[PDB]
Structure formats: structure tokens, C-alpha cells
Write a protein that binds this ligand. Structure first.
Ligand SMILES: OC[C@H]1O[C@H](O[C@H]2[C@H](O)[C@@H](O)[C@@H](O)O[C@@H]2CO)[C@H](O)[C@@H](O)[C@@H]1O
Length: 420
């Protein structure tokens, strides 16, 4: 269902899609091939749904963490840049988009969260998370608040969760151990507990989302926010005097943001793979192309060495890199999606007070560790249990799996049932 002789590109709504459309226009000027840039909601969830049916965009942009899951599902074409091209990008950015020994996307830019602060409200930003409650008390007395950031996406809370020892999957000898998840260890609980105490003491609101935090910062209502390089354009036009700096420490340890490499993958079902490669290699990944996108919404530290060098003196980028150095480049393994879903629920339920930190993180740990078992059984049920009421009841039971033994016990009932 994907049309031949044109390029449809999907990119997130917080990125420079207008600048990306300018690169599309230069492609059109040169080749007469139409480039259409779209920014659908929930695109990282929408892509695997549509592309599995052989549909969707020719090119998809997202951070590299989602791509191993897409590759594993056979949704992506292997990309074929020659050595001369590969040498133009930082080698570690290629590593981020390598899956089972194959390159599965073009790396574009390195993104890390930083602390963004209003220099007029707060000339010297706090070095520690611990000093933020006292600062908020002081600012509330002037009708302001200390900190607002998106509490609906776990990406923004992760740096604090990881600071004292939270981790996604343990890295042991070149590989991530999908059995060893670190979302309910003592460090993770300490970080989430700190965040939930900020909410309990009314230094933040559980309902704060991206739009609310951005508006409050850009209007001068809050002294600090946590956000990525894409956010800087809007702060520029707002005429807040702002700085970008290292995230605060927690229990004397740096905050450790998960670092994303914005990446562009080619849909396995695209009839336009050679056009996609030509657009990405010869138009986007050039000084000219990245500058167009960057001018729209900043990219971060770009993967293309020549242009990265030109931008690096910007202290906002220097702070991005300092934060990236303290954090870790995300895994790209297929288990990342369930990890993020699990942590999103934990943070939302703990912050709303619907669950305690300990209960919220224990459930997230289980969901992340058992996600493979649960997917296997849901697939098995769908293929082998024709009675819909029986199937729904099995699906309910899958939701209750805590571990490998639970998985085996339920699999036995599903096999027994299908063979009746
Ligand atoms: O919140 C979980 C979410 O985090 C990351 O998504 C980031 C993305 O990397 C950034 O480019 C920017 O758009 O903000 C997003 C957070 O809202 C992961 O890349 C993503 O897979 C994960 O679901």
C-alpha cells in the first residue's frame, strides 16, 4: 500500500519537521520526487502497527532505542552506506544503530536532557536535587516555582531514577541481560521516592505534562525545566534569559539521562529504498541538510563530524555533551519498548499516589522482566484458541504472570486447551 516514486517521512512533532521539509524541497528541486514530511501522534507505536501490514512511511525518525524492536519484527531494511560515507559520522553513532551485526538506520544526532534555568529568577542553579525543596519555598514567596518538567513520559524522570543505581537491563560481557532488570533496586526507589516527595510537599504537580512545563518555563513562571535540545528554539522566541547546564546530583551522584541517537530507518516494505538512501546520504546528512533541520529545532550534537565541529562551541551543546557523558546510550534491544511502558506506569501511579513507590516499581520490574513470556503466550493464544471467551480469559491470566514458572504453568493450560 506504500506508493512508488515518492517519499513519505515520519518524524516526531517536537523535532524540526519544517526544516526537514526544506531538505525535501531541495530533493524535489533536484530530482522531481515529492517528499512529504508528516508528524503523526504516537508515531513510535503507530509505525510497527502499520508497517507489519506492509504499510506506513518510507522513512521513520525516532531515537535508536525503538529500532531493534522494529528490526526484530522485520520492519526495517538493512542500510548499505559505503566506507567513505560511514567515515563521515562518529563511529559510536553507528554502534547505536547496529542490531545483530547489521546497520538498521542512519544516525542523525546525539540527544541528552539538560537542566534549563531562567537566569533572571535563578542566577546560580542548584548543583543538587536535595536543595530544590528549599529553593521552591523561596520562589513560591515571589509567586514562582523552582522546577517544572514532563512527569507523563519516563524519559524525563529516568535521570533521577538512575542517579543512585536504577538501570534498565544489566550489561554483562558485550550483551544486555534481559533477565536482569534494575527498576526496583534501592537506587531506583530512592530516586522515585525523592520525586514523589516533591509532589507530596507540593513542589511539583503530578499532572504536569510536556506542554504545561514548556509554557510555564517559556512564560517565566518557573525557574527551571528539564528538556532536550529540540526545546531551545521556543525558549529563544520567548525572550526568557536562559542557560543550559549539568543536571543536579542526587545523593552526591550525577543524574544519568538515557542518551538517544535520533536515527532514520527505511521501511522494509518501501518500494523507494534507493530514493530513501539518496535523500538520507546526499541531502540530509550533509552540512546543508542538518543546518536546515537544526535551524528549525536544534538537533543536539550531530553525528556528522564536519557539522558537529562547527556547532560545538555553543555552550548549550557543551552542556548536552556533559550530560550525555554522565548518562548512558540506550540499548536498542526489542525489550526496550516493554521497559519504557512499565516505567511509564510506575512513575504515573507513584506520582498520582495510586500506588506506593515500592509497589509501583515492583510491578514495573515484573512487567519488564516477564514481557517476553507474556508476548509469547498472547501470540500462542491468538493462533491456537478459537473460542473467543476462552481466549479472553487466557489473556486475563497472561496479565498475571510474575515469572518463568507462572509462564510454564499457563502455557500448559493453553496447549492442553488447544488440543481438546
Ligand atoms: O518516555 C519514554 C520514551 O523516551 C524516549 O523518547 C524521547 C525521545 O528519545 C526524544 O527524542 C524526545 O522526543 O522525547 C521522547 C520522550 O517523550 C525513547 O526514545 C522512547 O522510545 C521512549 O518511549
Amino acid at each position: 500500500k506504500i506508493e512508488e516514486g515518492k517519499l513519505v517521512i515520519w518524524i516526531n512533532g517536537d523535532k524540526g519537521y519544517n526544516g526537514l521539509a526544506e531538505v525535501g524541497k531541495k530533493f524535489e528541486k533536484d530530482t522531481g520526487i515529492k517528499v512529504t514530511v508528516e508528524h503523526p501522534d504516537k508515531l513510535e507505536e503507530k509505525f510497527p502497527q502499520v508497517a507489519a501490514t506492509g504499510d506506513g512511511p518510507d522513512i521513520i525518525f525516532w531515537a535508536h532505542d525503538r529500532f531493534g524492536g522494529y528490526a526484530q519484527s522485520g520492519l526495517l531494511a538493512e542500510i548499505t552506506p559505503d566506507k567513505a560515507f560511514q567515515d563521515k559520522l562518529y563511529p559510536f553513532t553507528w554502534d547505536a544503530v547496529r542490531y545483530n551485526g547489521k546497520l538498521i538506520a542512519y544516525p542523525i544526532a546525539v540527544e541528552a536532557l539538560s537542566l534549563i534555568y531562567n537566569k533572571d529568577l535563578l542566577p546560580n542553579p542548584p548543583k543538587t536535587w536535595e536543595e530544590i525543596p528549599a529553593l521552591d519555598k523561596e520562589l513560591k514567596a515571589k509567586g514562582k516555582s523552582a522546577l517544572m518538567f514532563n512527569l507523563q513520559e519516563p524519559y524525563f524522570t529516568w535521570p533521577l531514577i538512575a542517579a543512585d543505581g536504577g538501570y534498565a537491563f544489566k550489561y554483562a560481557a558485550g550483551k544486555y541481560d534481559i533477565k536482569d532488570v534494575g527498576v526496583d533496586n534501592a537506587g531506583a526507589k530512592a530516586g522515585l521516592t525523592f520525586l514523589v516527595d516533591l509532589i507530596k510537599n507540593k513542589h511539583m504537580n503530578a499532572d504536569t505534562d510536556y506542554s504545561i512545563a514548556e509554557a510555564a518555563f517559556n512564560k517565566g513562571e518557573t525557574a527551571m525545566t528539564i528538556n532536550g535540545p529540540w526545546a531551545w528554539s521556543n525558549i529563544d522566541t520567548s525572550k526568557v534569559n536562559y542557560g543550559v547546564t549539568v543536571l543536579p546530583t542526587f545523593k552526591g551522584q550525577p543524574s544519568k539521562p538515557f542518551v538517544g541517537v535520533l536515527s532514520a530507518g527505511i521501511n522494509a516494505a518501501s518500494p523507494n529504498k534507493e530514493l530513501a538512501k539518496e535523500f538520507l546520504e546526499n541531502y540530509l546528512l550533509t552540512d546543508e541538510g542538518l543546518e536546515a533541520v537544526n535551524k528549525d529545532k536544534p538537533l543536539g550534537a550531530v553525528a556528522l563530524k564536519s557539522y558537529e565541529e562547527e556547532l560545538a562551541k555553543d555552550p548549550r551543546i557543551a552542556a548536552t555533551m556533559e550530560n550525555a557523558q554522565k548518562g548512558e546510550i540506550m540499548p536498542n534491544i526489542p525489550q526496550m519498548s516493554a521497559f519504557w511502558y512499565a516505567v511509564r506506569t510506575a512513575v504515573i501511579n507513584a506520582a498520582s499516589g495510586r500506588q506506593t513507590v515500592d509497589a509501583a516499581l515492583a510491578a514495573a520490574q515484573t512487567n519488564a522482566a516477564a514481557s517476553g513470556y507474556k508476548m509469547t503466550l498472547l501470540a500462542l493464544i491468538k493462533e491456537s484458541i478459537p473460542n473467543q471467551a476462552k481466549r479472553q480469559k487466557f489473556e486475563m491470566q497472561v496479565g498475571g504472570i510474575r515469572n518463568e514458572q507462572d509462564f510454564k504453568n499457563l502455557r500448559r493450560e493453553i496447549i492442553r486447551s488447544a488440543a481438546q
